[PDB]
Design an enzyme around this catalytic site. Structure first.
Site, short mmCIF file in Angstrom:
data_model
loop_
_atom_site.label_atom_id
_atom_site.label_comp_id
_atom_site.label_asym_id
_atom_site.label_seq_id
_atom_site.Cartn_x
_atom_site.Cartn_y
_atom_site.Cartn_z
N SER A 126 0.83 -1.20 0.00
CA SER A 126 0.00 0.00 0.00
C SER A 126 0.86 1.25 0.00
O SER A 126 0.39 2.34 -0.31
CB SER A 126 -0.90 0.04 1.24
OG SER A 126 -1.79 -1.05 1.26
N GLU A 159 -7.63 -4.21 -6.41
CA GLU A 159 -7.07 -3.34 -7.42
C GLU A 159 -5.93 -4.05 -8.15
O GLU A 159 -4.96 -4.49 -7.53
CB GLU A 159 -6.58 -2.04 -6.78
CG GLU A 159 -7.68 -1.25 -6.11
CD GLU A 159 -7.16 -0.05 -5.34
OE1 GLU A 159 -6.38 -0.26 -4.38
OE2 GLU A 159 -7.54 1.10 -5.69
N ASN A 197 -7.16 4.13 -1.43
CA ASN A 197 -6.39 4.90 -0.45
C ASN A 197 -6.10 6.31 -0.94
O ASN A 197 -6.05 7.25 -0.14
CB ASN A 197 -5.07 4.21 -0.07
CG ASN A 197 -5.28 2.93 0.71
OD1 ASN A 197 -6.20 2.84 1.52
ND2 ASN A 197 -4.41 1.94 0.50
#
Lengths: 291, 291
Positions: A126, A159, A197
């Site tokens: 991430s 994703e 995010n």
């Protein structure tokens, strides 16, 4: 086309354990990887409990059916301490370990040597650019991002991140794997935060700043977004939920890469709570206290 | 205390008619004010239609009561084209007219002179500082913001905006009135966007800029935020729902007030759609096409 059937998941943490769980629950052959047999015994135990929990709820009227389900899923999950020992016969590697570029690269550089030609590599990171990691190998055409969300067994999104090098063939295979997992894949360039995010985190920060700025209480801000915007959780409740340390870490990275950008400016309240080791629901306390 | 019982709603628009409808439905005496009788006749008709749609469902078993409930509520709403003659003895004035500081200030500057001493003044403005209207009078202690959300009769949230001059007595009176409306009031200072829009709009713009950057398609972005963040609507679906022109107008206001802040930078795509009069569902087309 090469159908992803055997998946090697690296990282016994919450994310990797869930990835393995879903992959195995949907008929994929899985090998979960981590440093110690104990760490693996514990990770797989967390999976067992999660599965039984979902079982006693799906087959709430037939325990045997439930046992069989759990058993069938848990049996297709093997464990190993050295991923290099199993990727020569795997179709996909999904990495979910410490968010450290050096560690990840050392990992993939070595696996690149053992993995079969058709094997695809994907990171669940991430906080790093997928490209940065891909270039640690000479298999960039078969390298991409596969970003899940916690709790993995529940969140349907995934994703699929393509770098300027990922091949259409690699992409499609990952799109199909996602659907095979019962998830809904979406596509995004290899840019910081991808989609979720990238739009969620900056918003959470704004909530914090408005509060620090003293314009409104945390309670009202959460009430305001839940009732006024229909969100399942107010921003502070969600911060405590996703981890304050996890949040601060992602934002520090964005800030480091672009200091002049006001959207990544650190938060004294966030930094203080993390420094006081109040990471949210993880530690029984973040912005709010928990039982 | 000051118990609001007689309410003067200025503005026959969607929001104004909603505020009037809810106040009346909760036992308040209401006077809806606007420019012409045609406008009023229309707005009041809409209220009746909305009220009836509800009754046919809740009072299916006893249509008699349903009709009585709708009639009672309607008779409790009065109309007028002269605000000065109505506010002489009203308890609260809720203004929901055109987003233009000039017009708003003339209305209030005028009403301040005819309104009773105890009368409280409130604006439902989304694009203006509550303080920039309260000073257009000499009743600043009884002036505040009472921000509602469409569909007013459904959305239980209401932001009560207290400016540095607003009285604690006025604030509490407004807090009790909101509860009396069956709403849930949250507090916030008189800062741009208050709570909800301040945290929602900028996020919506970020989604647009992400799309314009070529990072992801509108479709994946909406899917990502719904499945990934649990949001009822994807950012583009919501933009079309809340009005592209409405959104653009608010962002332009923040942009002019501070053209430096990156969050308020104009979107070429947004501006284009507004230019070619594609404001969303209230036009049949915005980012997406409807019916």
């Amino acid at each position: 086309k090469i159908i992803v059937k055997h998946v090697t998941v690296i990282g016994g943490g919450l994310m990797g354990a869930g990835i393995a769980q879903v992959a195995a629950a949907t008929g994929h052959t899985v090998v979960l990887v981590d440093q110690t047999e104990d760490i693996l015994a514990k990770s797989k135990k967390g999976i067992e409990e999660s599965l039984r929990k979902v079982a006693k709820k799906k087959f709430a009227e037939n325990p045997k059916a439930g046992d069989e389900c759990v058993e069938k899923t848990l049996s297709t999950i093997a464990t190993s301490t050295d991923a290099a020992s199993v990727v020569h016969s795997t179709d996909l590697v999904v990495e979910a370990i410490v968010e450290n570029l050096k560690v990840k690269n050392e990992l993939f550089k070595r696996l690149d040597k053992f993995a079969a030609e058709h094997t695809i590599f994907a990171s669940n990171t991430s906080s790093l650019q997928i490209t940065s990691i891909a270039n640690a190998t000479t298999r960039q055409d078969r390298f991409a991002g596969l970003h899940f969300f916690n709790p993995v067994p529940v969140m349907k999104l995934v994703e699929v991140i393509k770098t300027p090098m990922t091949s259409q063939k690699t992409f499609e295979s990952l799109v199909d794997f996602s659907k095979a997992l019962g998830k809904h894949p979406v596509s995004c360039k290899d840019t910081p935060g991808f989609i979720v995010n990238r739009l969620l985190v900056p918003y959470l920060m704004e909530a914090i700043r408005l509060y620090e700025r003293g314009d409104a209480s945390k309670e009202d801000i959460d009430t305001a977004m839940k009732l006024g915007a229909g969100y399942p959780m107010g921003p502070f409740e969600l911060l405590d939920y996703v981890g304050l340390d996890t949040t601060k870490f992602i934002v520090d990275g964005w800030h480091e890469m672009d200091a002049e950008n006001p959207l990544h400016q650190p938060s004294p309240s966030l930094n203080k709570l993390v420094a006081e080791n109040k990471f949210g629901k993880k530690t029984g306390e973040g912005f709010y206290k928990y039982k």
